[PDB]
Amino acid sequence: ATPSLRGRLARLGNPRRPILKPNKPLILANHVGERRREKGEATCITEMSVMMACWKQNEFRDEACRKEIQDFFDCASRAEAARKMRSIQENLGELGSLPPKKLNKLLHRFPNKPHV
Amino acid sequence: TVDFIKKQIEEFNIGKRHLANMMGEDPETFTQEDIDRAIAYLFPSGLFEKRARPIMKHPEEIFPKQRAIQWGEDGRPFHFLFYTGKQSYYSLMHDTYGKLLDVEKHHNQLRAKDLLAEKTKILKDPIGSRWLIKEELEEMLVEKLSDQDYAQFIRLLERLSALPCGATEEDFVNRFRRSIPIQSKKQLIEPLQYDEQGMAFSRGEGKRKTAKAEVVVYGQGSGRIDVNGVDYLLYFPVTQDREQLMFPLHFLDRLGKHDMTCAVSGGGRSAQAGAVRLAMARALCSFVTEDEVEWMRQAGLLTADPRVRERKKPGQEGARRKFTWKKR
């Protein structure tokens, strides 16, 4: 259910005092907005820290710990593959919804009437 | 502009008669092919652009197609779609859609009579069939079109062909077919050659970067290579070049079995090695099986190397390198 609009805006007829002051008029627009691209954060940081502990302990000889090196590598590979392959599928599939282009077209087929 | 076309055809025929007379040929057996040679010889214009050179041709080919008159003398437009502004295109769309509906009806009656008697003619792919381009369609309706227009129409033809195809339907969609010409990249095998009681020698010619190379290979010989009358170890002191010469033979495992003579000119040492490489490769294609030819091509043995020195450009230094740019 949509929040009530009755009595809310400041109008010549309205008895009471405003509840909303809308910054820009509340009229459904004929297009939607474009999806905000996800803010990235560092990847692999945990495996990095584990490897760094392994080094600090074993005095930075690489032969000593081959597991944490190899696993940090494995992880960086999974973050590269992630960056490449996730871009396209996140840019197409919205799951249950439609890509904003299709939504815009659909909304131009049945637009809002402010006028008349 | 109709009187024009009539006149132009009159004078093209009178003229073709005249021309045939001076060139001293039979006016009946005179072709366009002959008209061309005749002008080319009479009005010899070197100009690089071929469209700017002298032309005498049948006015139908010279002049562009004309939209015919669209209405009678009373003002009533002949075609019922006239007011659309594109009659040609929307008629096409109309009849196409009509044939689609027709197909749907007929095939539904045949669904109720327990008959699917048709087949899918939609695979012409071995014929190398494609749709018309927008340009072609635009020429067939004598009318300008839009990209979305062309798109619409094509999509509709697709809808059509995706159903059971009638005879008149197949014939209909096939005006809009073209066939893409021959696609095969298979090479042309040099016929093997037998010379002066000597058996089995083949020839090939490489070109790389200012170096030309002609290589004759004998199948009947042992392994050695004579380049410009000397041994290949002497002519190509650098290992890298000897390896280049080795590449195609080692690839075909012919390394001991053939005996070659070469003439290479121009370029430096590496360019000559490259040239002989290519030529040798092209010569050994006579001796080998048709499959290994495809292999050599897929190893990049048979393609000339297009990379060549670029021209220095005025106001720069090196054909790319720029004179030092001072900001302030």
């Binding site: 087929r109 049945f110 637009p111 009437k113 | -």
Partner: protein
Amino acid sequence: FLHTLNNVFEPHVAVRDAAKMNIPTVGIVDTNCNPALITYPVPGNDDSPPAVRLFCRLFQVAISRAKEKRRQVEALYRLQG
């Protein structure tokens, strides 16, 4: 006009421009149409198939009938002299 609207639900341009051009206009105006600029409006349903098929058939027959009557009366006028 068999439908006075365009697929974006505003009035079809041709209405304003036929008016603009002094051309008289017949049209089937559904319940949500604006009849004002239409010379002879006929209120009724434009959306359902038997309706549109009906109106098509009617205007068809009227036209054909008229063109006939004109042919026949022309023939009569030709035999008059």
